[PDB]
Amino acid sequence: MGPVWRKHYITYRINNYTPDMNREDVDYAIRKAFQVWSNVTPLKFSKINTGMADILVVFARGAHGDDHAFDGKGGILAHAFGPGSGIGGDAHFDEDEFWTTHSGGTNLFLTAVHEIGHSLGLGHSSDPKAVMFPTYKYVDINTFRLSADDIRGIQSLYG
Ligand SMILES: NC(=O)[C@H](CCC(=O)O)NC(=O)[C@H](CCC(=O)O)NC(=O)[C@@H](CC(=O)NO)Cc1cc(-c2ccc(-c3cccc(Cl)c3)cc2)no1
Ligand SMILES: [Ca+2]
Ligand SMILES: [Ca+2]
Numbered sequence: 001m002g003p004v005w006r007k008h009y010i011t012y013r014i015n016n017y018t019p020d021m022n023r024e025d026v027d028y029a030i031r032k033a034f035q036v037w038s039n040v041t042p043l044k045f046s047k048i049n050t051g052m053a054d055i056l057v058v059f060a061r062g063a064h065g066d067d068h069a070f071d072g073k074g075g076i077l078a079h080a081f082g083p084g085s086g087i088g089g090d091a092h093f094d095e096d097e098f099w100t101t102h103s104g105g106t107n108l109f110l111t112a113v114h115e116i117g118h119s120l121g122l123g124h125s126s127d128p129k130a131v132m133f134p135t136y137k138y139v140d141i142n143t144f145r146l147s148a149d150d151i152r153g154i155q156s157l158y159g
């Protein structure tokens, strides 16, 4: 019962890239994270490099221009705004973390799946198996799957 996008074609743009990973790996992680949600909804996501994207993906540090300042290494890893114009939908990742493609540091893909959930209108789950649970936990990314609770949540918003 949070806000939803009132359309099924949603664009995203990667505003900037963490130096922790190569650009191609950031692109891949974000694309795959969007795919997780498109797989179970009518939503389609297209990356754009120019224009006005709905969801802006940002890596930033500390106080970074909104009311949700980061806290340095550890603690909060990322945050995102629910659907709406402007900053609505945007997903922000704390550059003070060490973003990775793997089990070391903080896995970008898994964190992005969680944040994009918020960008689409989901809140937190109390189900410890849900990607929308409030605390990060590395799982085998090649066997990762949305929980039934996550699928219930997103299908209740779209479709
Ligand atoms: N406490 C911890 O274990 C870590 C430690 C961080 C560190 O020191 O490096 N920190 C967090 O988990 C923080 C705690 C923040 C707080 O409440 O104080 N959580 C986050 O930063 C969240 C913040 C948030 O909710 N943003 O919207 C970000 C977050 C949530 C996840 C997510 C990913 C996968 C899963 C998961 C769980 C079970 C199964 C599966 Cl398949 C996946 C569920 C959650 N990824 O990013
Ligand atoms: Ca936006
Ligand atoms: Ca932090």
Ligand SMILES: [Ca+2]
Binding pocket: 018, 019, 020, 094, 095, 096, 097, 098, 099
């Ligand atoms: Ca970093």
Ligand SMILES: [Zn+2]
Binding pocket: 064, 066, 068, 079, 092
């Ligand atoms: Zn922010």
Ligand SMILES: [Zn+2]
Binding pocket: 114, 118, 124, 134
């Ligand atoms: Zn969250």
